[PDB]
């Protein structure tokens, strides 16, 4: 039972016997080393760099204070001079005390032997001391070594301290009293050039059992270090002379084994002692643990309901980054726990403090700065924003492509997981999840953002991009400059832009049909039959036009090219919930991409009255975002929650893509058949995939649910039907009317996404629409249930005969849309029938 | 040239994803878009012990060929489907229902073995939420309680195997030729029923056809 | 209301109570000080570089001279002789601020006692100070080097600083009647090569409970010196004769760790506060700011004629 709480000073030097982490790991020690001096010994203790160090020297010290062993206070290098030989640091403290107990004899019969024998000794060491620091062996002191000291009849020859060092320790002993005498050499990781020293001196001269001596680090260091010091007696014409591939790796391997050597003769395994972290300590998600270790984060409540260090990680995390209870909120808990002991305390309190201090909110601000300082350095390797002023939405999208350019990958780059091989991208992982989850809360405006530059963005880049592995961060250069990715662009200069990308790859009978896009003609072909005919602007009514202007882009090639980029409606949609008021979105995202955009192909490409009736159609669009304002703080978007959600729909995208793309028929006017396939059909099955690609995955990762309203079995996407979605629908809707939960609260983005306006015409076009006994049974119920959720009727009472049976006045469905052609398929294959 | 030995290698622990915690279905769910990266001969729609369903409706189909159904099956038949699918999302999306789901949805099993989610959430990310898309280096009764009595059965089997599982000391050396044993045995339906299918495998009954339900 | 004359000098030590840019921030970490020395004490201000460094500087020695923590006459090592160390200039600098007490009293009874004690302090100082004066240490200072001494509370024998400059900050307390020192640094943005004396001195001579330190500057420049320095404790042959990818990413890894580790231990992460940048004091163009803050635009326009920054 070890209590922690975060309100104490947490220093190095206040961790006391109650708060010590690691109590077992302090007394196994002492086992041994009362029975080592009685039956090299070397001690070493190994742990993490800034994990439970400087605690567990302090305890160690203490215990033996409280057989008998007299520790001498902890001597560190690094706070030492370099120059100065650790034999003078030790002798140094040695002295201290054997003369400061005899202070008060005064001339008693063994005051006088005691203090001469000692002065003695001092004489043998700075008479052999000078040796050690000599730069070089002048004639002079072989004076001393030819003279053999008669005193104290040594065995060993000449002036070497060695064996004049061991029994200044038995005069230590008998002086103070003591069964031995124990130095804790502290840590030379911040600076080990006199380290070195520390290392020769213990394996030169500690030698006798009387002594015990105890050594702290991190083994990858020494490694280093050994390592270094033994290619520094490689002479350097050798190291410059042979550049063979064998002499390089002979010595290699030679160096290899003198380390493994002089460790396993510096520290033996027996004697060296690991530090657990907490996370062994909790163990795996449910595993009993060795020992439990609580905080506590307030002064007002007592240490009776100490919390876990796993629940309060878990606590801290799963409403701070808004992650709900499941695989990856309780998997976040063993990254944070698996990182330095100290760094994930720091954070931890930081966050705790920080929330004392605000409460006297943006929550996810304030875990962002708990990581922030703590976690910086990883940021300057990632090329990460450090600046505070530049915490916006298209830098975050190019740092999140930053961070995909370290990595390397694009299939779960965009989840933002922080497990990468490398622990600084790890790192820089979860920071970079916590800012996606602090500044698109509450939104979602920059939530389709995020869906086209956040994590479409990378996607694109996968496909349409990549079809000399420096060739990989040369096109790289070429995506930033000249794609602009991350510069501060419209989604309707971004879509046009994303166009032309996916417009970049050919395909088969030269159609130019491609994942969601479809194609319109420009040129007035000879021998054109049928109502087909070249795409044309002015015949669609208010709300159609406008619809159509929210789904039209126009490449500036050497022809113009004209197309039906579904990403424009996801612009559309993005730019227009930004600004909600004003009647302002709309004067601009309508008409910026026809005339007032500048759309290239890239380098590595080798290429009535007209007012008054579209005031209604501008003013139906916004009536409808009065309620988005109470509505869109409900959503809590994390990283994994957009990640998860766009790749779905990137699997939703493709349905028509191939599946429609050869059922081109000369007869798809009003195309009733699933096989019937038209631009309107095509465009019907893509905008039916955004409004229900988020519905899946937003019951599995939001907070407000514990359950899922999806339910148990297979789910498929809308391909050439709704039969699966609408069944989908209706499982939802036993799943809640049966509970209290109005669906504009429990599923906000799906209330808000599917009522827009924008999309609405689209959702039935009159020549897209599945006209079948089998599929018409299924479409009545899907469109019932829908403008149910939408509440005012949506469509009128006459365009329910014309569009279930086969050029009427409708101002909510795109009319003209079906006419535009595709050219290439020539429409050699009229329409199977059996 | 000899960096590309190094430049396959730094590239494949980056998108096959090694070192990146998940589920196990997942491992193989980039597995598949690596075996379903190169297309054989003839088109023929046979690979690596995967199964590879038609979704488009080609004319004039005699016998009882046609688009697989999705809502006309039981749960058992369900459960086993949606732990043997697969998905891969391409210019042409490409559905799979490969078996190597099928040893990662029973994978995790064990390891929860409680808390009646892991028994209805692993089997589904792969079939809709876990999408895989192109690799860099391309050129392209009620309906929920029926699964009552396949969870019942399930949950048997799980009581039997969490107390039978703790006498288990393998060896990788067996393990790696477990694997390669395995590895090997698949070659066989990918390769000698590349030609065995045949116009009259409806419900075929000798070896010498191969319709879709006999390569796996 | 925040009003600043253009036409004024706006100099760091000409900036005006009602003239300083952050007026929340500054109360904000004397609270956070003075929190602290109820129970390593380092404060560190992460500031921009050229943005309102020293002028905040300058509150917090301002704000304290009015518990009692007494206010050094704020230090740099850049306005400093590059060799000159950083532990005998806060002696010095704690020694002025000592000295003008004592001779206030001007040969008084209690002046006598008090000035005893503080030559008799000095002196144990100036000889375990005295290896780091000069660069090469030469033998004859271990011999003098060790001395038989059990008062003062020797931690650990020799001659070594980390226990007697504690006691030295100590005697300080009792003679100024205050209850914590305060040293307060400026921008080492400026030259950041000689920062890392300052840096080791702030790590080794700094740590008594009833001592407060505050530094400042890009933190981003400390994890260059850092990174940099870390380097050198490898070998050259160590560099030359490990050139593969693998082993600079083993290195490029451990320095990282090794500098994340230093920082934190060093500059704690709830010590650390950011000077805000002028954008994040306007907010956005329209959200309302945290503090109006507006420009003394012309000569003879009114306090009250005053437009909005924007």
Redesign the interface.
């Known amino acids: 039972k070890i209590i922690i709480n975060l309100f ?2 947490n ?2 030097g206040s961790t006391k016997e109650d708060d010590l982490i690691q109590k077992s790991l302090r007394d196994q020690l002492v086992e041994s080393i009362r029975n080592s001096i009685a039956y090299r010994n070397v001690f070493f203790v190994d742990g993490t ?2 994990a439970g160090k400087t605690t567990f020297i302090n305890s160690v010290v203490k215990s033996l204070n409280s057989v008998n062993i007299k520790c ?4 560190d290098p690094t ?3 370099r ?2 030989p650790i034999l ?2 030790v ?7 054997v ?2 107990k005899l ?1 008060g004899y005064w001339a008693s019969n063994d005051y006088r032997k005691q203090k001469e024998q000692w002065q003695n000794h ?1 004489a043998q060491l ?1 008479r052999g ?2 040796l050690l ?1 000599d730069k070089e062996y002048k004639p002079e002191y072989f004076s001393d070594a030819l003279k053999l000291d008669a005193q104290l009849d040594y065995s060993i020859g000449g002036q070497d301290l060695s064996e004049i060092f061991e029994e200044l320790v038995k005069r230590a002993c008998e002086i103070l009293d003591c069964k031995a005498i124990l130095i804790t050499f502290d840590d030379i ?5 006199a380290g070195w020293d520390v290392l020769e001196s213990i394996r030169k001269f500690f030698n006798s059992r009387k002594l015990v001596v105890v050594a702290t680090g991190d083994l ?2 020494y490694s ?1 270090l050994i ?3 033994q ?2 007696n ?1 002479s ?1 014409t050798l ?1 410059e002379q042979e550049k063979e591939s064998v002499r390089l790796a002979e010595r290699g391997y030679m ?1 290899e084994h003198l380390e493994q050597q002089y460790l396993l003769k510096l520290f033996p395994v027996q004697k060296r002692i690991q530090l657990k972290t907490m996370l062994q300590l909790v163990g795996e998600k449910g595993k009993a643990g060795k020992e439990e270790i609580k905080v506590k984060t307030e002064p007002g409540m007592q240490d009776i309901d100490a919390i876990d260090v796993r629940q309060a990680i878990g606590d801290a995390v799963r409403e701070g980054l808004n992650l709900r209870e499941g695989s990856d909120a309780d ?1 976040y808990v063993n990254e944070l726990l698996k990182q ?1 002991v ?2 994930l305390m ?2 931890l ?2 966050f705790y ?1 920080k929330k004392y201090h605000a409460t006297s909110l943006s929550v996810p601000n304030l875990l962002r700065n ?1 990581l922030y ?6 940021i ?2 990632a090329g990460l924003n ?1 600046e ?2 530049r915490f916006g939405m298209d830098s975050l999208c190019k740092d999140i492509f930053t961070y995909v350019k370290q ?6 780059g965009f989840y933002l ?1 922080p ?6 991208l790890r790192n820089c992982s979860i920071y970079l999840a916590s800012q996606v989850s602090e500044n698109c809360q509450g939104s979602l405006s920059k939530f389709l953002q995020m869906l086209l530059v956040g994590c479409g963005s990378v ?1 694109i880049f ?2 349409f991009v ?2 000399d ?1 420096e060739k ?1 961060e040369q096109l790289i250069s070429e995506y930033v400059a000249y794609m602009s990715v991350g510069r501060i662009e419209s989604a309707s200069h971004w879509a046009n832009r994303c166009c032309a990308v996916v417009a970049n ?1 050919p ?1 088969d009978e030269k159609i130019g049909v ?2 969601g896009m479809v194609q319109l003609n420009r040129k007035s072909r000879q021998h054109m039959p049928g109502g087909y005919k070249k795409f044309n602007i002015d015949t669609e009514n208010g709300l159609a036009k406008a619809a159509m202007a929210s789904s039209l882009s126009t490449v500036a090639s050497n022809n113009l090219m004209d197309f039906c980029s579904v990403f424009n409606l996801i612009g559309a949609i993005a730019d227009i919930s930004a600004c909600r008021c004003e009647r302002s979105a709309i004067t601009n995202a309508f008409n910026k991409v026809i005339a007032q955009t500048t759309c290239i192909v890239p380098p590595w490409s080798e290429a009535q009255d007209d007012a008054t009736e579209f005031s209604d159609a501008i003013t139906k669009v916004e009536q409808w975002l009065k309620n988005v304002n109470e509505i869109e703080i409900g959503i809590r978007p994390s990283a994994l929650l957009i990640g ?1 959600v766009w ?2 729909f ?2 939703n ?3 028509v ?3 429609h ?1 050869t ?1 081109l028929y000369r007869n798809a006017e009003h195309g009733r058949m ?2 019937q396939s038209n631009a309107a059909k095509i465009m019907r099955f893509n905008v039916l995939a955004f409004l229900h690609a988020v519905l ?2 937003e019951s ?1 990762y939001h907070s407000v649910s514990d359950r ?1 309203y999806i ?7 809308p ?1 050439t039907s709704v ?2 979605f609408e ?1 989908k629908i209706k ?1 939802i809707g036993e799943k809640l009317k049966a509970d209290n939960k109005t669906w504009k609260n429990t599923h906000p983005l799906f209330f808000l996404l599917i009522s827009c306006p924008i999309l609405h015409p689209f959702i039935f076009p009159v020549g897209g629409i599945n006209c079948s006994v089998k599929a018409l049974n299924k479409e009545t119920s899907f469109n019932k249930l829908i403008d149910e959720i939408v509440g005012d009727k949506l469509l009128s009472d006459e365009e329910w005969d014309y569009l279930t049976k086969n050029q009427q006045i409708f101002q909510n469905t795109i009319t003209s849309l079906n006419s535009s052609t595709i050219v290439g398929a020539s429409y050699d ?1 009229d329409t ?1 029938a ?1």
Do not use: C, W
Request: net charge positive; hydrophobic share 30%; proline share 5%.
């Open positions: 104490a000073p220093l190095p760099r800034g001498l206070p902890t001597i706070k030492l001079p120059h100065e003078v640091t002798t140094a403290r040695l002295n201290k005390m003369s400061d202070k001092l700075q001391l000078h620091t990781d911040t600076q080990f050039d990858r260091l280093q390592r270094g010091k290619y520094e490689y350097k190291l160096v998997m330095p100290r760094l720091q954070v309190q930081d403090t708990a300082g703590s976690m910086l350095s990883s300057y390797r450090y505070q002023h990595d390397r990958d694009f299939n779960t997981r497990q990468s091989e490398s622990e600084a996607s996968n496909q990549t079809e592995r990989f790859s395909n491609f994942l998860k790749s779905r990137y699997f995208l493709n349905n893509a191939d599946q793309k059922r699933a096989s899946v995955e599995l899922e339910g148990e079995g297979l789910r498929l996407n391909v039969d699966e069944k499982i294959k199977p059996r």
